[PDB]
């Protein structure tokens, strides 16, 4: 089979199609038109976008395909280095850091993060309890405040104090600007053109702001003494069982940058989309709120109670199905192979997995794919293999998945226990694309049920 390809622009090939504010949504529309696979070419680059479970289930075979750094990840590697998310599987520091940090995400470790997650969640609840009559909530803004504070505290015992601020923390301003610059480089035909000198100077400044915070985090800890048993503790003291080695100092700094970014951005999108879908689907909101009231019987949730918020967990997975907030990942062929019995690939050929489109495969989910129905997730064994991939694949899947879902279930459960919510503007979904996806401008009103936190 010859695969289709979207419209071209002479020698720029397909690259101008991604010169848009919303490239993932542009790629979803191409997939809608062209189907389960299309060729995408740019000057000096070829990739193939996959959208069907039929093909992606083959692409997830780790004996045939390994993680590729997309151009986005390659440009982010200029400040995330060989941290876990921007390392190749074959670099020594990938497996070393993977082995050292996996126990920081055990369910036992989650039991230890729980109290600090509650600390920040209570700050969010108190903020909303303290709003005056007919004031409203800026939803992604507050969810980002929460997820940033949670990864700083839980992981590094650093307080960003986001709920004390209107303007984002300087780290965020620089992080956002550095991520946007990295992604802008994709469209630059002549990146050494002097027109980009200011962009380059600004990029170095933003990387320095980020690295200054990492130095502060490391110096604060080395003063305090090893007595926090958190992520930084393992980054500073853990030894890889295979090599016997600890992480070196340069790699630790890259991990701190990696986790501060990865540990907050897509989780804030997930919580924002989950609240969006609940207020748009009030029967679902009512069922989730009934579960919260029944389970969360104490002034703050326990670790076990969060594990018992089954339906809330289903709500989160169904929000990840429609808007997976880390919406793509890239693979390369380890050897010559044939995809789907129809598309021969050579060793080194690249693939992109377009996760939001995979999650709309009607052969898997039925024709009602656009509807919000958490009950699709009642049973993992009823979901075909590789049909649902919001956390990636295989040994390169998200190391933070359980942290993200514990945090999001805790927070959404407390939100549903403590407030009734109103979609007072009849909000029209507008999805902003950065490193992640978020519903821009999403606002609600939250009426307190007046249930105390002490
Ligand atoms: C709802 C929230 C999240 C989503 C949807 C998400 C999604 C993903 C995806 C799709 C990947 C694979 C990327 C690729 O193959 O290129 C990944 C990897 C990773 N994520 Fe997440 N993530 C989330 C939360 C987190 C959190 C909370 C952390 C840290 C606490 C984290 C840290 C990482 C890291 C370090 C990797 C690289 C893992 C490796 O390759 O060894 N993520 N994430
Ligand atoms: O593939 C990634 C990188 C996604 C990173 C996902 N992520 C987030 C957190 N962890 C992982 N972008 C997509 C979409 C895109 C295209 C052009 C410009 C910008 C974006 C692509 O290049 O096709
Ligand atoms: C896949 C984790 C998100 C991330 C974090 C830092 C740098 C690149 C990607």
UniProtKB/Swiss-Prot annotation:
Phenotype upon changing residue 45 to Q/S: 2-3-fold decrease in binding affinity for N-myristoyl-L-methionine as substrate
Keywords annotated in UniProt: Cytoplasm, Electron transport, FAD, Flavoprotein, FMN, Heme, Iron, Metal-binding, Monooxygenase, Multifunctional enzyme, NADP, Oxidoreductase, Transport
Annotated positions for site Important for catalytic activity: 266
The keyword Transport is assigned to this record: yes
Cell compartment(s), UniProt: Cytoplasm
Outcome when changing residue 328 to P: Enhanced activity with small non-natural substrates with altered product profiles compared to wild-type
Region (Cytochrome P450): 1-453
Biotechnology: applications noted: This protein is a target of protein engineering. Its selectivity-directing and activity-enhancing mutations have been extensively studied and the designed mutations allow this enzyme to act on non-native substrates and/or in order to enhance production of synthetically desirable end-products.
Known outcome of mutating residue 84 to E: Ineffective covalent modification of the heme macrocycle. Extensive formation of Fe(II)CO complex in the substrate-free form
GO cellular component: cytosol
Residues holding (9Z)-hexadecenoate: 49
Chain residues that bind heme: 398
GO-annotated molecular function: aromatase activity; flavin adenine dinucleotide binding; FMN binding; heme binding; identical protein binding; iron ion binding; NADPH-hemoprotein reductase activity; oxidoreductase activity, acting on paired donors, with incorporation or reduction of molecular oxygen, reduced flavin or flavoprotein as one donor, and incorporation of one atom of oxygen
Effect on the protein of changing residue 262 to C: No effective fatty acid oxidation. No effect on electron transport from NADPH to FMN
Expression triggers: By pentobarbital. Expression is negatively regulated by repressor bm3R1 at the transcriptional level.
Family to which the UniProt record says this protein belongs: In the N-terminal section; belongs to the cytochrome P450 family.
Name of the protein in its database record: Bifunctional cytochrome P450/NADPH--P450 reductase
Species per Swiss-Prot/TrEMBL record: Priestia megaterium (strain ATCC 14581 / DSM 32 / CCUG 1817 / JCM 2506 / NBRC 15308 / NCIMB 9376 / NCTC 10342 / NRRL B-14308 / VKM B-512 / Ford 19) (Bacillus megaterium)
Designated gene of the protein: cyp102A1
Residues of the full protein shown: 4 to 456 of 1049
């Amino acid at each position: 089979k010859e695969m289709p390809q979207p419209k071209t622009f002479g020698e720029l090939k397909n690259l101008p199609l991604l010169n848009t504010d919303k490239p993932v949504q542009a790629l979803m529309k191409i997939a809608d038109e062209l189907g389960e696979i299309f060729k995408f070419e740019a000057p000096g680059r070829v990739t193939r976008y996959l959208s069907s479970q039929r093909l992606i289930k083959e692409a997830c075979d780790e004996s045939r395909f390994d993680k590729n750094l997309s151009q986005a990840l390659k440009f982010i590697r200029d400040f995330a280095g060989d941290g876990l998310a921007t390392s190749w599987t074959h670099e020594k520091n990938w497996k070393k850091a993977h082995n050292i940090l996996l126990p920081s995400f055990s369910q036992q470790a989650m039991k230890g993060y729980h109290a600090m997650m509650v600390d920040i969640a209570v700050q969010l609840v108190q903020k909303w309890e303290r709003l005056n009559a007919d004031e409203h909530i800026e939803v992604p803004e507050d969810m980002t405040r929460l997820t940033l504070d949670t990864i700083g505290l839980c992981g590094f015992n650093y307080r960003f104090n986001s709920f004390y601020r209107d303007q984002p923390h300087p780290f965020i301003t620089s992080m956002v600007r550095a991520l946007d610059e990295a992604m802008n480089k994709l469209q630059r035909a002549n990146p050494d053109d002097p027109a980009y000198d200011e962009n380059k100077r600004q990029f170095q400044e933003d990387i320095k702001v980020m690295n200054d915070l990492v130095d502060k985090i490391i110096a604060d800890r080395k003063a305090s003494g090893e007595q926090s048993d958190d992520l930084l503790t393992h980054m500073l003291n853990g030894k890889d069982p295979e090599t016997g080695e600890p992480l070196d100092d340069e790699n630790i700094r890259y991990q701190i940058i990696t986790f501060l970014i990865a540990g907050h951005e897509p989780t804030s999108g997930l919580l924002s989309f989950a609240l969006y879908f609940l207020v748009k689907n009030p029967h679902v909101l009512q069922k989730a709120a009934e579960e919260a009231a029944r389970v969360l019987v104490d002034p703050v949730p326990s670790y076990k109670q969060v594990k018992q918020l089954k339906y809330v967990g289903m709500v989160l997975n169904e929000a990840l199905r429609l808007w997976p907030t880390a919406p793509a990942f890239s693979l390369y062929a380890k050897e010559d192979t044939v995809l789907g019995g129809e598309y021969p690939l050579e060793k080194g050929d690249e693939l992109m997995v377009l996760i939001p489109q995979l999650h709309r495969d009607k052969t898997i989910w039925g024709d009602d794919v656009e509807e919000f129905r958490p009950e699709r997730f009642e049973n993992p064994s009823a979901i075909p293999q590789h049909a649902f991939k919001p956390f990636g694949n295989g040994q390169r899947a998200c190391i933070g998945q359980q942290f993200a879902l514990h945090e999001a279930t805790l927070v959404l459960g407390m939100m549903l226990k403590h407030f009734d919510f109103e979609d007072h503007t009849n909000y029209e979904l507008d999805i902003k694309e950065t490193l992640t996806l978020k519903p821009e401008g999403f606002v609600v009103k939250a009426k307190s049920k007046k249930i105390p936190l002490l």
